[PDB]
Design a protein around this ligand. Structure first.
Ligand SMILES: *[C@@H]1CC(=O)N(CC)C1=O
Length: 404
């Protein structure tokens, strides 16, 4: 009846953990022994887990349940243990049980163990930092220059203070007037969209309805930034009669299109995309839409759309084919329909599509992930990869999450 948190080795930038010291304290209070594999890579220091009752050892063969952020590869995986991770044949010989956090879903079917809003919180900070660089490359110093990447801050609190400081400069009228008012569009309904809005709320922001973007993008107060939250009924219409039936779209999305390209996109400065996109879902923007959207000392912007940030890792933007890295976060989409990875001064739209956004705020990501995983840890400690799964007293959340 021993638990172990293994060290991450998949990536040099994987600084998260499946549990925080607060969760190790609660598990040790139940009487369970917790082993902590040493890791200079983790954002939360080893001694914080030791202060919470965790024992730090390099050998975790004593444990029955071994928790990790990503799946252990080849030799590191050993027999007669129960593992859990994100992401056959010889499983039965080695008698090991593998659990995938992604498969932990409730009766409704929505995932219970995720990273929550922190992909959106980090994405909003990154795209605000990216707009500062992109607008300066176009010849405009803005308060967005005083916002760094999400991983340059100890936590979201420190990042919020930087966003509020830059927002104060905007309220003082220090924005260049020639580029006009800035409009931000939030798509999607998940927690990542709410996390992006949480950062946006620290600016001198004003929320408007999607139909107001056309007027707001022309006459908006230059001491403010403007945002709108896009719902399905704002842009999805039937191909035949332009009617929106919410139940019909949820069953037959192939009967609908998106007027985002004509109704919203021409009046959008920055698009924060958190859309859940399936293969037969109407696309938000096509390649031809991008071609149409791109056509003295205080000059205006070449095009209204400055940048796009993908915070849900999800084909709705046709020309956002490739992904980016925390070290190289931004790329450009040229009017020649080419992807430029480092030419922020080039022609086009700034684009950001980092796949490990929560890893930029790994402390709070570890705590939020650990808060979701905590109510299922004890039943996973009592797991016996030797005994059959039917004998184990698993909740349907954990039982369905077993991939072996
Ligand atoms: C835990 C952390 C997080 O983002 N959520 C969603 C509100 C949780 O439940």
């Amino acid at each position: 009846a021993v638990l172990a948190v293994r060290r991450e080795d998949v990536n040099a930038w994987e600084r998260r953990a499946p549990l925080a010291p607060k969760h190790i304290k609660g598990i040790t209070n139940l009487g369970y022994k917790v082993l902590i594999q040493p890791s200079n890579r983790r954002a939360i220091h080893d001694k914080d887990y030791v202060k919470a009752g965790g024992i730090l050892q390099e050998d975790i063969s004593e444990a029955c349940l071994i928790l990790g952020v990503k799946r252990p590869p080849e030799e590191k995986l050993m027999s007669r243990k129960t593992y859990a991770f994100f992401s056959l044949d010889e499983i039965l010989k080695q008698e090991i049980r593998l659990i995938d956090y992604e498969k932990m879903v409730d009766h409704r079917g929505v995932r219970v163990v995720a990273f929550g809003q922190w992909a959106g919180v980090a994405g909003m900070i990154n795209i605000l930092h990216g707009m500062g660089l992109r607008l300066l490359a176009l010849g405009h110093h803005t308060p967005f220059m005083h916002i760094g990447m999400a991983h340059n801050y100890r936590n979201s609190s420190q990042a919020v203070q930087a966003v509020r400081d830059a927002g104060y400069e905007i309220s003082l009228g220090l924005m260049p007037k020639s580029i006009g008012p800035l409009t931000f569009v939030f798509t999607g309904t998940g927690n990542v969209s709410k996390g992006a809005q949480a950062i946006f709320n620290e600016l001198p922001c004003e929320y408007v309805e999607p139909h107001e973007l056309k007027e707001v993008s022309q006459t908006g107060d230059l001491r403010k930034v403007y945002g709108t939250v896009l719902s399905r009924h704002h842009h999805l219409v039937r191909k035949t009669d332009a009617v929106y039936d919410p139940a019909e779209y949820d069953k037959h999305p192939e009967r609908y299109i998106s007027r985002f390209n004509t109704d919203i996109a021409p009046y959008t400065t920055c698009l924060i995309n958190g859309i859940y996109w399936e293969q037969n879902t109407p696309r938000l923007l096509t390649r031809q839409d991008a071609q149409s959207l791109l056509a003295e000392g205080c000059p205006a912007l070449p095009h209204k759309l400055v940048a796009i940030c993908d915070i849900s890792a999800d084909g709705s933007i046709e020309f956002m084919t490739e992904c980016t890295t925390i070290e190289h976060p931004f790329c450009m989409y040229d009017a020649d329909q080419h992807i430029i990875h480092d030419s922020v001064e080039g022609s086009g739209i700034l684009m950001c599509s980092i796949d490990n956004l929560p890893a930029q705020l790994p402390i709070e990501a570890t705590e939020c992930f650990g808060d979701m995983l905590y109510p299922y840890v004890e039943e996973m400690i009592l797991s016996d990869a030797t005994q059959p799964l039917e004998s184990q007293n698993f909740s349907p959340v954990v039982r369905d999450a077993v991939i072996t």
